[PDB]
Design a protein around this nucleic acid. Sequence first.
RNA 1: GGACAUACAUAAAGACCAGGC
Length: 278
Amino acid sequence: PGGFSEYVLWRKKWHAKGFGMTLKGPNDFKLEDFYSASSELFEPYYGEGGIDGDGDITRPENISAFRNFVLDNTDRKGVHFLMADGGFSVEGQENLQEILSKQLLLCQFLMALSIVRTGGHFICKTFDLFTPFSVGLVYLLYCCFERVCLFKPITSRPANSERYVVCKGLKVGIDDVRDYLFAVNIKLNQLRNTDSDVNLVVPLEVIKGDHEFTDYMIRSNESHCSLQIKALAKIHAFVQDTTLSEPRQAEIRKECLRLWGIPDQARVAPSSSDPKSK
RNA sequence: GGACAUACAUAAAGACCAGGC
């Protein structure tokens, strides 16, 4: 429901304009619930048919209609940055979350190359990144941007595979990689419910030929696994012994809010002012 | 991965009988 958007709109007030696309349903944009931000500065668009579309990011037509709409609403330049927080329930298949979400990862990366301006930025949620498919998608972003990193914020839960790819400075000439990833998404859609799938988007010999990329990718995965293993074992110990507690949670909270410049206040429904007093 | 039924209301009706001015 656009929690990420609320912070950006609240931080920049009206000096910002947001464009949204998400699946219609229980997890649609709750623009009414933006208590800290002016929801009028945001515009949801659900692909083909605009407001009446389904918002399927994996579907190409939703991407295309949104793509034309976003470029038009940005003087044909695109957005300064894209945020992407895609995920769905994998209840009882948590170990397969990467493989199950692979097309959603691709479509969010394709969306970055479709609507981010030159010199613009991208941030996308991902999970595990073990498969050559997911690593080849990160390699294409590393080619297309001045700088890329894999980052797990402390606001992500330590025991889950959730991390963010963060890309800074979209290069010129990314059109071929965009149109390639658009063709790969069409191929994934054709292979839905078949015994075949797209297993590579960059050859393993190309990825492993960049030793500097490969040495970062391995080290990022193994460091994340090591921290996730400790955090999973910690949760298991805190199930077995219910007297265990983190004593510093209230201290760490106060310091994080101070550091990030976030006021320590409760969520209050605006207040209803009358138009004369306001 | 909350109420004073402040509903004063039991008044059968109907009948005959007795008395009052």
